């Protein structure tokens, strides 16, 4: 059926735009800017607006995280899209925030988030939809409790929006957008694509590998703070695979016998929630080079980890990935075929990568017009994603301390980060990877 | 050498229109007047997302083709 399309990530950051290839748009007779009624898995309906996208496959339909969650759909699923011309300018629309994202923020959540979000953009709205509004360095959720034309509606400047406070609790079915997604990782687009091609099919369609081998071990290595844990969490969340973090320090802290039992039960629990991803953070802490270890219990724990990784073979649909700084950091016999057979190098973000990371970490922040992330991204040489996040946080703190001399959401949204704050943060940047080898595509 | 533009009004009268590459604001205004009774001076044009306003070009640059592309929809307003 032509209306069936495979979901994909959206470059357009707008919350209510569905990107399509022009061939598919004309095949569907869909005109840019028209409303479309996407159909989800559990009878979820999302009213969005279709925009052509040159870099999009005909079958592929690009959607934002918010739209995906509204439809309870993950990347690679199939959704039904058809035009919905029967859209009316609803007058009474009752919208509420979500408690988990409005804690510690006061002031009416209108004229701060909702009003600028709608204003006059004529964003389509459907009953029960969840949408995210960024402002005041916070991403506030909102649930469309009611719409005047049940259920589809399109906001209008004369539309009356009711926000009676009383934030509603998050229903377990809903997946908070505060969770990590593929859009929360920047710089490592190539490595993220590699991990996608590596792990998407085993996690999304385990039965196929059950019939027709799958990758069981992926070793993400690079300078610390590059978001390896972030990448693993994003992959687990997007693929709907149970995630289990095994911090190396956590295991080493446990007394002898306690640590091995903890590791074994972690592996067993991950197996029982298949498909699942087990993230062995700081693997070098658990299994360092043979020379480094000088303890019977340490060698016992390394052997136990090896035995569990081997035992994954008789198991299935479980992908173990770990974080390190260099393959030689961990002992050999862990990269042997099977256990941790695949490798990935997150590396240092490049100029474009640093710009992408800065944009990701400054989404909620309101930065003045004079702030140009390109110039700073050029300035920040040898900065890791964690360093860029810390720099953005420092700029925000600078702005906050400056404004404090003169929390109300209106005040928070009033303050704007200026290029002077970013320059000061640079002066206090303190890069963490200024000595690592530089690998990128030259801009010269 | 042609354009295929959907016209959707807040009233609800959806319609289709055929345009040409070289088109001025007055051409779309008269086409709208033909398709719908709305006078050309009572229509406020929004296009794209966020919908940019498309007001008549001022004096000096009202000869070039309107930047409207082929395959998009145009929202019509009634005063």
Author numbering:
A (entry chain A): 22 to 233, 236 to 429, 437 to 474
B (entry chain B): 773 to 851
Sentences from the paper on this structure:
The VCPIP1 ubiquitin regulatory X (UBX) domain engages the N-domain of VCP, which is a well-established primary site of adapter protein binding. The VCPIP1 UBX domain is bound to the flexible N-domain of VCP limiting the resolution of the initial reconstructions which was addressed with C6 symmetry expansion to obtain a high-resolution map and build an atomic model. We observed that the VCPIP1 UBX domain folds into an archetypal UBX domain structure. The interaction interface is mainly formed by F821 on the UBX domain, buried in a hydrophobic pocket formed by VCP V38, I70, and L72. Additional contacts are made between VCPIP1 P823 and VCP A142. We also identified a possible cation-π interaction between VCPIP1 UBX domain R778 and VCP F52. In contrast, the constructs lacking the UBX domain, VCPIP1ΔUBX and VCPIP1ΔVCPID ΔUBX, did not show quantifiable affinity for VCP, while some possibly non-specific binding presumably from interactions with VCPIP1 VCPID and/or SHP box was observed. These results reveal that the UBX domain of VCPIP1 is critical for VCP binding. Using TR-FRET experiments, we assessed the effect of nucleotides on VCPIP1 binding and find that the absence of exogenous nucleotide behaves similarly to the addition of AMP in the complex, suggesting our complex is nucleotide free in line with not observing nucleotides bound in the structure. Although exogenous ATPs were not used for structural studies, VCP N-domains were seen in the up and down conformation for the VCP-VCPIP1 complex and further refinement with six-fold symmetry was done in both conformations, but there was substantially less UBX domain density bound in the up-position compared to the down-position (see intermediates in Supplementary Fig. 2).
The AAA+ ATPase valosin-containing protein (VCP)/p97, known as cdc48 in Saccharomyces cerevisiae, is an essential and highly conserved protein involved in numerous cellular functions, such as regulating protein homeostasis, endolysosomal trafficking, membrane remodeling, chromatin regulation, autophagy, Golgi formation, and others. Its core function is to unfold ubiquitylated proteins in an ATP dependent fashion. Previous studies have established that post-mitotic Golgi reassembly requires presence of VCP, as well as two adapter proteins, VCPIP138, and p4734,35. VCPIP1, also known as VCIP135, is part of the ovarian tumor protease (OTU) family of DUBs, an essential family of enzymes that remove ubiquitin tags from proteins to regulate protein homeostasis and function.
